[PDB]
Design a protein around this nucleic acid. Structure first.
Ligand SMILES: [Ca+2]
Ligand SMILES: [Mg+2]
Lengths: 55, 235
RNA sequence: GUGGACAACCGCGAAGCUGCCCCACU
């Protein structure tokens, strides 16, 4: 049951990275930041890349 | 894009159209305020190019548009159509004035070597542009988009005569009327993940679009992400 | 099989290395 990046991308939304420990560390692309849950990515600018805001 | 659908006003805010001696001759993707990424074969000939972001209908005016003049063209230094048509078909365009980012003008995310390839391997991307609505036709009025399944290089090679280098990849249908065409070239092949879009491909040559047993050929962005980021680096 | 061109029950290893899988001989 120990999490690593090679299963469900370590439940990271965008980018996974393995650690020396039994932990993974999630990150995000430029203009996003890591959410409170340390998994999801949320915007850190008015208009981040790859985002539609018109509907 | 043949067998596609009409994109809603701001559905692909990273899309740009290229205008020269003729309007809508190629597409492009916003990297940042000052840089566009397109195909090399869209910009070999040294005509003064004009880029338009916040486009939707190229025949009408929506007041969301932003025209910019290209002041530098960097074709990938290994590209040469005399040697090979498709290989290294990617280029960067620097604009005169910065675009101002908003809901209709937004960059496309560019991951790293590894994740760009992972996202490609999901096996389904979004291609778009104001290209031909048919095999032989006029430029599309409204922006067209189509979802294209990634195709195995072995099966693609067995269908299309061309060798697929590691810088290329095939996408589309076998017995379909679905594919990108001329005009779409230089446009984005984009994979979406958790509602965020990443540049996974550049749309290449598209003449003879949707012939039975002929897939679309695209430039594999994963291989050029370092180069893109290096050259388009602001400041 | 021979000759030429080219990540695969994810093989080696941080910059790439390997080659399971089109063309001429069949
Ligand atoms: Ca217009
Ligand atoms: Mg190799």
């Amino acid at each position: 049951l120990d999490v690593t990046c090679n299963i469900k991308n370590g439940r990271c939304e965008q980018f996974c990275k393995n650690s020396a420990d039994n932990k993974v560390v999630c990150s995000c692309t430029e203009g996003y930041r890591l959410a409170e849950n340390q998994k999801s990515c949320e915007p850190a600018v008015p208009f981040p890349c790859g985002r539609v805001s018109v509907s | 894009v043949v067998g596609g659908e009409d994109a809603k006003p701001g559905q692909f805010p990273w899309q740009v159209v290229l205008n020269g001696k003729v309007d809508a001759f190629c597409g492009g993707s916003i990297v940042n305020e000052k840089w566009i990424v397109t195909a090399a074969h869209c910009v070999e000939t040294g005509v003064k190019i004009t880029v338009v972001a916040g486009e939707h209908n190229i025949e009408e005016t929506e007041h969301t548009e932003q025209k910019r003049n290209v002041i530098r063209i960097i074709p990938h230094h290994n590209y040469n159509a005399a040697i090979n048509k498709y290989n290294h078909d990617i280029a960067l365009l620097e604009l005169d004035e910065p675009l101002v980012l908003n809901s209709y003008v937004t960059p496309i995310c560019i991951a790293d070597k590894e994740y760009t390839n992972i996202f490609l391997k999901f096996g389904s991307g979004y291609v778009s542009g104001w290209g031909r609505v048919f095999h032989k036709g006029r430029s599309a009025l409204v922006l067209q988009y189509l979802r294209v399944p990634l195709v195995d290089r072995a099966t693609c090679l067995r269908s299309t005569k061309f060798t697929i280098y590691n810088n290329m990849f095939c996408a589309g249908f076998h017995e379909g009327g679905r594919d990108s065409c001329q005009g779409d070239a230089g446009g984005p092949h984009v994979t979406e993940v958790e509602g965020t879009s990443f540049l996974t491909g550049i749309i290449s040559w598209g003449e003879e679009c949707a012939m039975k047993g002929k897939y679309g050929i695209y430039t594999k962005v994963s291989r050029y992400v370092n180069w893109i980021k290096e050259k388009t680096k602001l400041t």
